[PDB]
């Protein structure tokens, strides 16, 4: 593979981090990688959470290509447990790692007791009071300090840093998180994102991150709408979105998935970014009611790859018998356009400028 030039948010990012970006730039027009949250640490069919097993592997004989985790495994109290070992196992497999922020509420996190008080889901506006000048800026900085120390020590067997796609303040166009759209003006949200990237990169010297932005799906699918809370080309490497749909009567929702994917794909080409579907799944009520769509994955891949823009996403990441759902996923795996962990190669040693 020949040298390419890449422009990242972190102009001093490691060679492997630059290569990851270059890899996705090429790969994304030849496949869509499959990603899964908690791939080797949570599952219905796994007997070890040490990073050696996954539901994906037990279903189709390979791991997800993209491994998703979150800061509940990094920032105290680390309720999901550490993931250093599991990240290293995934990287050793040539996998791609992405971590999303799920920060506690900096304004209320000492008040924890009755869920959701003090967590991401505590809707108490905390953006204004967590920026520099705000009373709770030191609390946010504590979270960012722990993310940075984690990233700065996240090393492979040769002592080299492991690249991570770090996805900040997701689903920010809704109001269920403290960084949401009822909790901040667009400018205040942009400041929260930018401040956090700058703190990690410049104050704490993180060199192994690509930065991802991921609002919810828009129903009015326009660039202007995506741009309202967009942190800016100087601050984002990866353009994503999050979408959760109905188990039944979901043709409209699937068209909307494709439309949003097409939008970020077109914007990504214009702006030198990687377009992705950062999170996709079925809304939580439908899954807890035991409902299922045994054509879900086949609809997903068929809709995406038929669309000339949506097909150019680098990956989609899904977040959590006899009903036909296993066969559906096996078909998705067998599809020529999906890529699982063994289907990707030469991710991290591509020469860049």
Which is the catalytic residue, given 234, 279, 327, 336? 279
Of 136 and 317, the one with the shorter C-beta distance to Zn ion is 317
Pair of tokens at residue 325: 């759902």
Among 242, 286, 293, 307, binds Zn ion (CB under 5 A): 242
CA pair distance 206, 14, nearest whole angstrom: 10
Which of 104, 101, 70, 62 has the alpha carbon at shortest distance from 87?
A: 70
Residues 281-310 that bind Zn ion (CB under 5 A): none
Span near Zn ion by CB under 5 A; candidates 108-116, 138-146, 259-267, 273-281: 273-281
Taking the complex as a whole, the smallest distance from the CB of residue 35 to Zn ion amounts, in Å, to 11
Is 171 designated active site?
Answer: yes
Is 279 near Zn ion (CB under 5 A)?
A: yes
Is 181 near Zn ion (CB under 5 A)?
A: yes
Is 109 near Zn ion (CB under 5 A)?
A: no
DSSP lists the bridge partners of residue 99 as 69, 166
Pair of tokens at residue 207: 């060199």
DSSP lists the bridge partners of residue 242 as 216, 279
Which of 205, 118, 159, 116 has the alpha carbon at shortest distance from 16?
A: 159
CA angle 279, 50, 22 (to 5 degrees): 45
Cβ atoms of 254 and 303 closer than 8 Å: yes
Contact characters 22-51, Zn ion, x per CB under 5 A: -------x----------------------
Taking the complex as a whole, the smallest distance from the CB of residue 119 to Zn ion amounts, in Å, to 12
Annotated ligand binding at 121? The verdict is yes
Of 16 and 242, the one with the shorter C-beta distance to Zn ion is 242
Q: Which residue has the tokens 């009071």?
A: 129
Taking the complex as a whole, the smallest distance from the CB of residue 336 to Zn ion amounts, in Å, to 15
Taking the complex as a whole, the smallest distance from the CB of residue 213 to Zn ion amounts, in Å, to 10
Taking the complex as a whole, the smallest distance from the CB of residue 30 to Zn ion amounts, in Å, to 6
Torsion of CA 254, 260, 261, 266, to 10 degrees: 150
Pairing of strands 242-245, 277-282: parallel
Burial level of 146, CB count in 10 A (0-12/13-18/19+)? middle
CA pair distance 197, 52, nearest whole angstrom: 32
Span near Zn ion by CB under 5 A; candidates 82-90, 163-171, 282-290, 333-341: 163-171
Span near Zn ion by CB under 5 A; candidates 110-118, 179-187, 191-199, 217-225: 179-187
Is 279 designated active site?
Answer: yes
Work out the number of other CB atoms within 10 angstroms of the CB of residue 301.
21
Annotated ligand binding at 320? The verdict is yes
Cβ atoms of 34 and 226 closer than 8 Å: no
Of 28 and 201, the one with the shorter C-beta distance to Zn ion is 28
Of 29 and 48, the one with the shorter C-beta distance to Zn ion is 29
Count of residues in contact with Zn ion, rule CB under 5 A:
8
End-to-end CA distance of the chain: 13
Shortest-Cβ-distance residue relative to Zn ion: 170
Interface residue list for Zn ion (CB under 5 A): 29, 70, 72, 80, 170, 181, 242, 279
Binding-site residue set for substrate? 80, 102, 121, 176, 244, 319-320
- Give catalytic residues, as residue numbers: 171, 279
């Amino acid at each position: 593979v020949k040298p390419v030039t890449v422009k990242l948010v972190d102009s001093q990012a490691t060679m492997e981090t630059r290569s990851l970006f270059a890899f996705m730039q090429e790969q994304r027009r030849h496949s869509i990688m499959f990603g899964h949250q908690h791939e080797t640490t949570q599952g219905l069919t796994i007997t070890r959470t040490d990073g050696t097993q996954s539901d994906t592997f037990n279903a189709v004989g390979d791991f997800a290509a993209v491994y998703g985790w979150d800061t509940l495994s990094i920032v105290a109290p680390k309720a999901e447990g550490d993931i250093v070992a599991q990240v290293k196992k995934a990287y050793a497999r040539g996998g791609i790692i992405t971590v999303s922020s799920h920060f506690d509420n900096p304004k209320t996190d000492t008040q924890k007791g009755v869920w959701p008080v003090g967590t991401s889901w505590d809707q108490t506006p905390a953006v204004v009071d967590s920026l520099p000048g705000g009373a709770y800026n030191p609390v946010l900085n504590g979270y960012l300090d722990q993310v940075a120390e984690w990233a700065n020590n996240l090393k492979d067997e040769q002592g080299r840093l492991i690249p991570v796609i770090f996805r900040l303040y997701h689903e920010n166009t809704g109001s269920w998180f403290w960084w949401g759209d009822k909790q901040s003006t667009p400018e205040q949200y942009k400041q929260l994102f930018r401040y956090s990237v700058e703190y990690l990169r410049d104050v704490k010297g993180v060199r192994n991150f690509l930065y991802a932005y991921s609002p919810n799906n828009f129903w009015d699918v326009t660039e202007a709408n995506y741009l309202e809370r967009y942190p800016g080309d100087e601050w984002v490497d990866v353009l994503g979105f999050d979408t959760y749909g109905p188990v039944a009567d979901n043709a409209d929702w699937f068209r909307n998935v494709v439309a949003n994917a097409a939008l970020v794909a077109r914007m990504a080409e214009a702006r030198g970014k990687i377009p992705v579907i950062s999170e996709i799944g079925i809304r939580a009520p439908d899954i807890e009611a035991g409902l299922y769509d045994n054509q879900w994955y086949r609809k997903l891949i068929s809709g995406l790859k038929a669309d000339p823009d949506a097909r150019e996403i680098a990956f989609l990441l899904v977040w959590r018998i006899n009903n036909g759902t296993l066969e559906d996923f096996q078909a998705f795996y067998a599809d020529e356009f999906t890529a699982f962990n063994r289907d990707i190669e030469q991710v991290y040693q591509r020469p860049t400028l």
